[PDB]
Amino acid sequence: SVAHGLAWSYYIGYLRLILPELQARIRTYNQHYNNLLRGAVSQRLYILLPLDCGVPDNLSMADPNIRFRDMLPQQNIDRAGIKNRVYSNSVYELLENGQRAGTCVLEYATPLQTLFAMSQYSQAGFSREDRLEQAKLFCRTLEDILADAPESQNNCRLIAYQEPADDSSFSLSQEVLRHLRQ
Amino acid sequence: SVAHGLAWSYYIGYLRLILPELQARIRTYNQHYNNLLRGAVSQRLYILLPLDCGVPDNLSMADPNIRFRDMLPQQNIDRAGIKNRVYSNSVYELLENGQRAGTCVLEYATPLQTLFAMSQYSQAGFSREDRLEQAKLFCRTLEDILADAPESQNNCRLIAYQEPADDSSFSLSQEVLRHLRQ
Ligand SMILES: Cc1ccc2c(=O)c3cccc(CC(=O)O)c3oc2c1C
Ligand SMILES: Cc1ccc2c(=O)c3cccc(CC(=O)O)c3oc2c1C
């Protein structure tokens, strides 16, 4: 299935690269946050998985209570055939009742952008119902891969969410804070 | 199918990013090769697609007549949700009868590493015959995507190859030189 390929490629071609040294980067970042009240960043990579159509270009614009703060130190990759690539990860503040309630490394899972594009291009043969079915299966498959994987290690957390078509009351910051608070 | 997901994700998540400015990077690189005898780099990204099992960790070690020379100038990416990533591409010399016969940007298609890993991990449910079938379909599917794609533009060339199980006479440098010479 499409989802099975996307889940394995995202693990092999991203998570496996980025997770092993994530903790050390976070540790380095948190040297500037010895005052806990200034908001040290939490330890995990939180991966957002909106099942519904589209993924926002700008994560912080998804929710007024999620605000971009800055970046972790960069990760240089020189293995698995790739030469000198540099990856970045972003740190966001989560607000609740006007005050910072959490700080974390957040990002959308990129293969959802591929599922979205396939649904737009008719040569992909991919209906909207197919897109949703594969998005769901991508999430399940990736969950299962990570349960086994050596590189996590309490390193990564998937946050999948789907909103009712007729309501816009879902709060992404609240959803992430739920995961943070445990 | 697995291949369909891999082909679309490699287009959306790599080729679409790297191809639009490739020409300009090559032009910049070739400022140091105004003497053609020193070997200016050819214009396309040549993507190697070995269908057989495994992809070499080190492209230049695949063939004594392919030698790594150096890198293009880097490509900074800050769009499609990714913040400040830096990509690189490698320039190789191709030799024939002891002398340089071509110079090009070469790399293996990364989703083949994913197909290889899926064949190694039993939770993937993926036999060796499945792996080959999907590798072939990945190549066909990607070919078809690129035929349409706006970002190439005589920018990219796929070089797929499969060797007989009982013979080791295939020369990768000769195969690439064939494509270069047209
Ligand atoms: C911008 C973009 C869009 C889609 C993918 C993708 O499907 C995809 C699937 C597997 C692995 C990757 C690599 C990554 O997320 O760095 C992928 O990257 C994508 C990227 C970077
Ligand atoms: C090291 C490695 C391994 C596998 C993939 C991959 O399957 C894959 C599939 C689609 C898109 C990408 C992104 C890329 O090649 O930069 C992919 O990247 C991979 C990388 C970088």
What would you note in describing this structure?
Two copies of one chain form a homodimer. Chain A is of the alpha/beta class and 182 residues long. The first copy, chain A, has two domains: 1-41, Single alpha-helices involved in coiled-coils or other helix-helix interfaces (Up-down Bundle), CATH 1.20.5; 42-182, Rossmann fold. The first copy, chain A, has helices spanning 2-18, 22-29, 111-120, 128-148, 172-180, and strands at residues 45-50, 66-71, 75-79, 82-87, 90-96, 99-108, 156-161. Chain A is globular and about 55 Å long. The interface between A and B is large, with 39 and 39 residues. The structure holds (5,6-dimethyl-9-oxo-9H-xanthen-4-yl)acetic acid (1YE) (2 copies). One (5,6-dimethyl-9-oxo-9H-xanthen-4-yl)acetic acid (1YE) sits between chains B (6, 9-10, 13-14, 110-111, 113-114) and A (9, 12-13, 80, 82).
Q: What is the general shape of chain A? A: globular
- Please name the CATH topology of the largest domain in chain A: Rossmann fold
Q: Helix proportion of residues of chain A, in percent?
A: 25-40%
Oligomer: homodimer
PDB class: immune system
Keywords: immune system, innate immunity, cGAMP Binding, Membrane
Assembly: dimeric
Entry title: Crystal structure of hSTING(group2) in complex with DMXAA
